[PDB]
Write an enzyme that holds these catalytic residues in place. Structure first.
Site, short mmCIF file in Angstrom:
data_model
loop_
_atom_site.label_atom_id
_atom_site.label_comp_id
_atom_site.label_asym_id
_atom_site.label_seq_id
_atom_site.Cartn_x
_atom_site.Cartn_y
_atom_site.Cartn_z
N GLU C 264 0.77 -1.30 0.00
CA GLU C 264 0.23 -0.09 0.09
C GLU C 264 0.97 1.40 -0.09
O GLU C 264 1.88 1.30 0.71
CB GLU C 264 -0.93 -0.11 1.29
CG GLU C 264 -2.10 -1.27 1.05
CD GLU C 264 -3.02 -1.02 2.32
OE1 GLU C 264 -3.23 -0.26 3.23
OE2 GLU C 264 -3.83 -2.14 2.07
N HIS C 287 -8.00 1.80 1.64
CA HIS C 287 -8.06 1.01 2.90
C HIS C 287 -8.65 2.11 4.10
O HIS C 287 -8.07 2.38 5.03
CB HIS C 287 -6.53 0.92 3.23
CG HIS C 287 -6.19 -0.01 4.78
ND1 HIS C 287 -5.26 -0.68 4.83
CD2 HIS C 287 -7.17 0.07 5.77
CE1 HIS C 287 -5.38 -1.52 6.02
NE2 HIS C 287 -6.55 -1.02 6.54
N1 LIG Z 1 -10.87 -2.68 6.05
C1 LIG Z 1 -10.49 -2.17 7.20
O1 LIG Z 1 -10.28 -0.78 7.15
C2 LIG Z 1 -10.04 -2.76 8.54
C3 LIG Z 1 -9.81 -4.30 8.45
N2 LIG Z 1 -10.11 -5.19 9.55
C4 LIG Z 1 -9.82 -6.46 9.63
O2 LIG Z 1 -10.72 -7.33 9.35
C5 LIG Z 1 -10.68 -8.64 9.83
C6 LIG Z 1 -11.62 -9.21 10.63
O3 LIG Z 1 -11.74 -8.15 12.03
P1 LIG Z 1 -12.83 -8.72 13.18
O4 LIG Z 1 -14.15 -9.20 12.61
O5 LIG Z 1 -12.59 -7.60 14.25
O6 LIG Z 1 -11.59 -10.00 13.66
P2 LIG Z 1 -12.26 -11.17 14.27
O7 LIG Z 1 -11.22 -12.00 14.63
O8 LIG Z 1 -13.28 -10.62 15.34
O9 LIG Z 1 -12.97 -12.22 13.06
C7 LIG Z 1 -11.86 -13.03 12.49
C8 LIG Z 1 -12.60 -14.26 12.42
O10 LIG Z 1 -12.13 -15.12 11.14
C9 LIG Z 1 -11.93 -16.63 11.64
N3 LIG Z 1 -10.84 -17.22 11.03
C10 LIG Z 1 -9.79 -16.67 11.39
N4 LIG Z 1 -8.55 -17.64 10.21
C11 LIG Z 1 -9.54 -18.27 9.38
C12 LIG Z 1 -9.30 -19.03 8.47
N5 LIG Z 1 -8.13 -19.11 8.07
N6 LIG Z 1 -10.42 -19.73 7.67
C13 LIG Z 1 -11.55 -19.37 8.01
N7 LIG Z 1 -11.96 -18.30 9.27
C14 LIG Z 1 -11.01 -18.00 9.89
C15 LIG Z 1 -11.61 -16.52 13.16
O11 LIG Z 1 -12.15 -17.64 13.56
C16 LIG Z 1 -12.51 -15.28 13.39
O12 LIG Z 1 -13.92 -15.49 13.94
C17 LIG Z 1 -9.18 -8.33 10.61
O13 LIG Z 1 -8.10 -8.79 9.74
C18 LIG Z 1 -9.10 -6.96 10.74
O14 LIG Z 1 -7.80 -6.41 11.04
C19 LIG Z 1 -10.95 -4.51 10.79
C20 LIG Z 1 -11.03 -3.09 10.78
C21 LIG Z 1 -10.92 -2.51 9.71
#
Ligand SMILES: NC(=O)C1=CN([C@@H]2O[C@H](COP(=O)(O)OP(=O)(O)OC[C@H]3O[C@@H](n4cnc5c(N)ncnc54)[C@H](O)[C@@H]3O)[C@@H](O)[C@H]2O)C=CC1
Ligand SMILES: NC(=O)C1=CN([C@@H]2O[C@H](COP(=O)(O)OP(=O)(O)OC[C@H]3O[C@@H](n4cnc5c(N)ncnc54)[C@H](O)[C@@H]3O)[C@@H](O)[C@H]2O)C=CC1
Ligand SMILES: NC(=O)C1=CN([C@@H]2O[C@H](COP(=O)(O)OP(=O)(O)OC[C@H]3O[C@@H](n4cnc5c(N)ncnc54)[C@H](O)[C@@H]3O)[C@@H](O)[C@H]2O)C=CC1
Ligand SMILES: NC(=O)C1=CN([C@@H]2O[C@H](COP(=O)(O)OP(=O)(O)OC[C@H]3O[C@@H](n4cnc5c(N)ncnc54)[C@H](O)[C@@H]3O)[C@@H](O)[C@H]2O)C=CC1
Lengths: 405, 405, 405, 405
Positions: C264, C287
């Site tokens: 990025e 992003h």
């Molecule tokens: N686009 C943006 O500006 C932002 C991006 N994010 C990203 O979004 C993602 C999710 O955030 P949250 O929901 O708060 O995280 P979270 O941890 O609450 O959700 C992650 C989920 O993915 C599941 N998971 C992990 N590895 C997996 C795999 N390889 N196969 C299938 N499922 C799997 C986990 O079991 C968990 O339920 C994170 O990577 C976070 O950094 C979050 C906020 C902003």
């Protein structure tokens, strides 16, 4: 106006919204009575009334009606109409209106309230405590969430009970003789025996007909689960009450809530009697399923409204004893004509206008076995219309005619 | 392993779910009674019991407590703990657990079902039907939808009730001593007297304490809406019953539903009495606001949980007679020490480890006025943890000690 | 107070709610900057600051940190923390805090918005019309109601997308490596290949780890249906972008929406480049998935709050580089002590108090491989505490110590 | 029977659902083209067509109309009818049908998806990404939840949009010329200038008529909230585009989404232009607010419905160039007569029956300025209905007549 002249008789205390609906529409000639009338007061108040609004207590009998000399239409500010001689009214060209579906909310709410407490054994516990007996137990008492409710009769009332029921997290099942579109997450069940087999609470919302007579019998109730509950706020002919007593005292059912009965006290002074009166785990209610202020204001608007529409434009949409007819108000002058249903009449009526060069903008005639009712808009000045009104009346078979505007 | 030697005593017919999840945890040494035990049987079956689960009728008195040789913890499989001598249990390093909020859904479903029917005047109408009087009358009956519910105490039960009442279409207002984050479209009123003025239905859901004692008095009742309803299924101290009676008699209130009273029958054979028993338009229930099968199961899962946890890992989170301690399980051997709250104990315990070169990984000590409770994780062999335990047991001021694993 | 003395450095324009949180808690010594700082301004503003709040742009490097001589704690007013040298901070006993889940709403909303338009071919149509080309067609354009949405990653963000998605009448499916409790009407799918096979829109919400690296590959995308849509607002390593280009230009996918990329632009002046830039049926966003005012105010409250708690009571709950410890504030005086994780330390610390007859009310020590952090409440007057603070400091292995209150 | 001889012409690729439900009705004579027909082919394939369904490009001109020998009714399988010469069709007793409100869901889903992204400044950010500029910035981006949507015109689309916006957590306000019953917790504002002052997002959903023409002018735009968004997917007359441009340029508005324009490209090969094409923070769509596959299916079911009904039973309910007539099917033979609106026609028609002793059961006649349309049920044999039809056909002023059954 000449509307300060058109008289409204209102008995049995309809909701004040009915009155304020009439005023809003310019009808102020209102005789209002809180209670019901004996014949001599009735025959006397009605005889110069263009419209009457009654409830379930006044009997508008063939003779009462024939005693009324200026009567144009009848309004049952209620559901039932059997207190009225429909054929008598119809032979004098007086249509009758009602409020068939204006309290479904009141019925749905009552059954929610009642299943919650019956599930919890509160009626029994409440009666016990009014007699000094304290009975604290958890065994046998259940929450409503997660229970299966069986609706027999998925109509206006059955469907909205469904919604309230899901809101509380009940699983909702139903059986109708007709296929229906499930609402929310409701499920239709093909055979009644399956619905009965898996419902914790069963509530009936069917009409009154040969197919519904003693529909819930010993047999059917032996099909409900041990400890299940039966509620009937539909009609008193629907449930075999002695079958239900036996089922209550053997404890196959844990309880019940009944609002309607095969026979009902004719008035509030007459004694209520039922073999279910000896069970504290049963709720008994004086056929009040629909008896609310909210509903009484709904009916008062609908039926008052229905009368005003007919006065103002001749609509018989939803009249129960009469050919249904209504016409959007566009042009010129409106007349109406009720008559015997025989050839030549309509042609004579239209001929009155064709002969003198008067255009007819619109016309709506509809018939029953024995009677025809037509509305016409014609394009003419006051005079021509007054006169055609006069000629319309002389047509062989004419029952009645009116110049609306 | 060890888990077999650990005896669990369950009296008074707790929920099967307690047995099930005790079992899943690896605990199969279980003496279960569906009923209450007599002095003679209680004292001989608890003699070697490591844990005991009881309900409301078993009386855990200092006599019983001090005789029970092997007892580690007590579980009140109920909200209350008055049956247990908390102070004696504490004196012996025996924590007491319960389940204060496993009843939430039952109390809410109850308030709803009651407010539905009271608004509709059904209790009074059912009472009349049962004695043969038919009272068919819509005046004074109202639908719940559109009315204002005023909740006092917006906690576990308050909030969940507000949700249900919104599913019913009611408008939800509340009053609480501290500032709450509203769920759905509920609305916090800042003054109580406004909350009472505007409400069609008032329901109390507050603790029993000096500040709630008779909080709904004559003054407060006189502020409620004319023709409104009062419901109390909180605690029996909270409402002045005599004053409630006057309000009902004068017809200022149109009904109420009371589930809890200033004093209550002890047994079910004992007689109940209340000035409110004179009203048909009042519901009186024997403090069954949380008495459902589902609640019994909640309580069963949760309290067993609390015992299993205190066993597996020493957590006194939520114990009612005890310092609250909790520690994530990460490393080493975990040990537990209970002692008098006085200088020098903590130091001597830690010195056992420091002087023999043993690393301490975590430690949580909390105190009550009079007692200290501390959990410790150490990095050492099995032998070492064993000798340590012995030395700990001899630290001056020690009440009890245990090698968790 | 002596709080007018404790200095807060805040860079990159955190939300003003962070500032008003500090004032509300009596901390007014705030240096606030809208933008980011070059090293010479940073090394100079930080050196006398007890706390710093930064965003994703400031690099708090090992040396920057060692240049700060009064630094107590660090606050990432954002999710990421990699801009910070955690081990450097931790070796100086400076804990680091963040806001891991304070913008899940912003991400959920973005994906709703984006799938609606992608379903409808609006991005392509919007770009076309900015170039003079009008393209009105119904073919290929769909409503969202009745479509199946596949969520890969059912966490904070995945679950709330689920809810918003049902609200619009989509069928919601999801796949996680963990078993989860479906919300609303969501359904978990065991194999990923099945989820891909029946989803109209696929949205990824997984973290960044070896298991998620290029998780969406050529193979996986060949498994989505013809005309399906792929959205990635998770992390830039999750989707094989060249595999996706090929899939877009062969039209196996109808479109896509990407917010995160393998590499990025380091700042807003640096050029963005991607093979997806040539497709009008793709949404590309810098992003910004979490970049809202609402989220910026959430993070500002949480993280400002987190710093104040630690200042005021030593809580390291949710610190990412530090042993987690927190203690309910009951009695006496609070001290804290960070040190090397070796035997004897805790015993020396408690010995300081045992020797002079001072009672210890509570203590919480927790450790990492290499460091220990403990909080103690002791019962003494100001003087004794000042002095013990002094003695605590001299303990071999002591990194840092503080008298909180 | 007869139904086979009845030829249906479908051009321009209407929905399969039209074919399906035409078929279910018993109509299998069908010439279907997925494409547009050329003068030469249209005029030879319509020559014997009883009905024709077309879209937007087929031009039903008086030339074509008067050549089509056997034509009974036209169905515009779209909202618009400008492609059809309504006046010519009327002149030949040929009703025109369409589907004005089968597009409701597509327009609402569009407004939502657009307001989500504009609030977030995504269109501008996507535009920048596509040309290699990275603009990561949270200032000025907002979540939709908590913001105020101001809907102008609370009809079919207005109301359904308000529902969706409430599912998104927005607060829904509307302004309309007449008084509306609000759905969910929407709120009717009585003055427009208050509705505009308070709104974060304004969306127009009003007809095209003299009163809406440029209703959103400079004055009205200057009343909107600073930093608000305007969305118009109603009609292109409704908003002054130049003034909208000034508002955007001055940054008084932070964006908009326009789907309809004062003039629009005829073909898709024709060029599009707009002062608004200069803004990246504006969405411009080619009047696709209702262009989905689902809408195509709605329109297909409904319009075929309207043709099948007019065929089976003469209903002109909802026809756009014609007297509206509808009659319940009950008895006898139904006959249909279309004629000049002048005295004496009605009478002569009815005389055919009166003079031969034939009873008339129902009759509905409505008129336009210039034409009369009447349906009649008679009680007679098949022979009689046949001769009657012949005589009717010869009544002076007759345009066309038909024996429905
Ligand atoms: N686009 C943006 O500006 C932002 C991006 N994010 C990203 O979004 C993602 C999710 O955030 P949250 O929901 O708060 O995280 P979270 O941890 O609450 O959700 C992650 C989920 O993915 C599941 N998971 C992990 N590895 C997996 C795999 N390889 N196969 C299938 N499922 C799997 C986990 O079991 C968990 O339920 C994170 O990577 C976070 O950094 C979050 C906020 C902003
Ligand atoms: N308790 C009270 O104060 C009042 C009683 N009612 C009664 O409740 C009943 C239902 O009222 P609505 O829902 O408005 O009527 P409804 O006609 O809308 O519902 C009746 C439904 O029952 C179904 N049904 C009819 N016969 C059946 C059969 N034998 N087996 C299974 N299903 C059958 C019909 O298909 C229909 O859906 C009526 O009998 C009405 O008079 C209504 C208002 C108040
Ligand atoms: N009928 C029954 O069998 C049962 C009775 N209860 C009783 O219900 C009551 C409420 O239960 P929960 O909601 O679980 O308790 P809770 O602790 O969750 O809620 C109590 C709420 O009342 C508020 N409050 C405290 N004092 C107040 C005052 N002076 N004025 C106004 N608000 C005040 C508190 O701030 C708190 O929000 C308790 O007294 C509990 O013992 C609970 C379960 C069953
Ligand atoms: N973008 C597209 O492809 C489509 C555009 N439309 C257009 O959307 C508009 C709305 O559609 P519907 O909701 O179905 O129409 P509708 O007739 O159901 O609603 C129109 C509403 O606007 C109100 N209204 C009329 N004049 C007004 C005025 N001067 N100020 C404020 N309110 C006024 C009316 O009272 C009525 O409630 C129509 O112009 C229709 O042609 C409809 C479908 C698709």
């Amino acid at each position: 106006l000449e509307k300060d002249k058109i008289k409204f008789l209102l008995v049995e205390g309809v909701h004040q919204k009915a009155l304020e609906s009439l005023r809003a529409a310019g009808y102020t000639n209102i005789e209002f009575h809180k209670g019901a009338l004996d014949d001599e007061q009735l025959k006397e108040s009605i005889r110069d009334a263009h419209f009457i609004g009654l409830r379930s207590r006044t009997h508008l009998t063939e003779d009462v009606i024939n005693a009324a000399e200026k009567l144009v239409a009848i309004g049952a500010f209620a559901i039932g109409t059997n207190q009225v001689d429909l054929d008598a009214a119809a032979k004098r060209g007086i249509p009758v209106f009602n409020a068939p579906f204006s309290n479904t909310r009141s019925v749905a709410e009552l059954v929610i309230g009642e299943l919650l407490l019956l599930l919890r054994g509160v009626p029994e516990a409440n009666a016990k405590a009014h007699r000094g007996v304290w009975n604290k137990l958890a065994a046998g008492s259940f929450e409503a969430r997660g229970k299966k409710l069986g609706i027999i009769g998925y109509g206006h009332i059955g469907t909205q009970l469904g919604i309230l029921a899901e809101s509380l997290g009940m699983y909702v099942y139903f059986y109708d003789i007709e296929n229906k579109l499930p609402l929310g997450n409701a499920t239709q069940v093909q055979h009644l025996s399956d619905l009965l087999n898996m419902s914790d609470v069963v509530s009936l919302h069917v009409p009154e007909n040969p197919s519904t007579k003693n529909m819930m019998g010993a047999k059917e109730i032996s099909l409900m689960k041990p400890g299940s509950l039966l509620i009937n706020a539909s009609r008193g002919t629907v449930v075999d009450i002695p079958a239900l007593a036996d089922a209550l005292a053997s404890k196959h059912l844990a309880g019940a809530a009944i609002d309607v009965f095969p026979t009902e006290p004719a008035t509030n002074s007459d004694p209520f009697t039922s073999p279910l009166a000896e069970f504290d785990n049963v709720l008994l209610t004086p056929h009040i399923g629909g008896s609310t202020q909210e509903a009484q204001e709904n009916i008062g608007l609908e039926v008052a409204g229905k009368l005003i529409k007919y006065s103002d434009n001749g609509s018989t949409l939803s009249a129960v004893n009469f050919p249904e007819v209504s016409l959007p108000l566009h042009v010129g002058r409106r007349l109406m004509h009720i008559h015997e249903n025989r050839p030549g009449v309509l042609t004579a009526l239209n001929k009155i206008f064709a002969e003198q060069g008067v255009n007819i903008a619109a016309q709506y005639l509809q018939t029953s076995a024995q009677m025809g009712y037509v509305v016409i808009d014609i394009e003419a000045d006051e005079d021509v219309a007054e006169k055609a009104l006069q000629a319309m009346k002389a047509i062989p078979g004419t029952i009645r005619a009116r110049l609306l505007y």
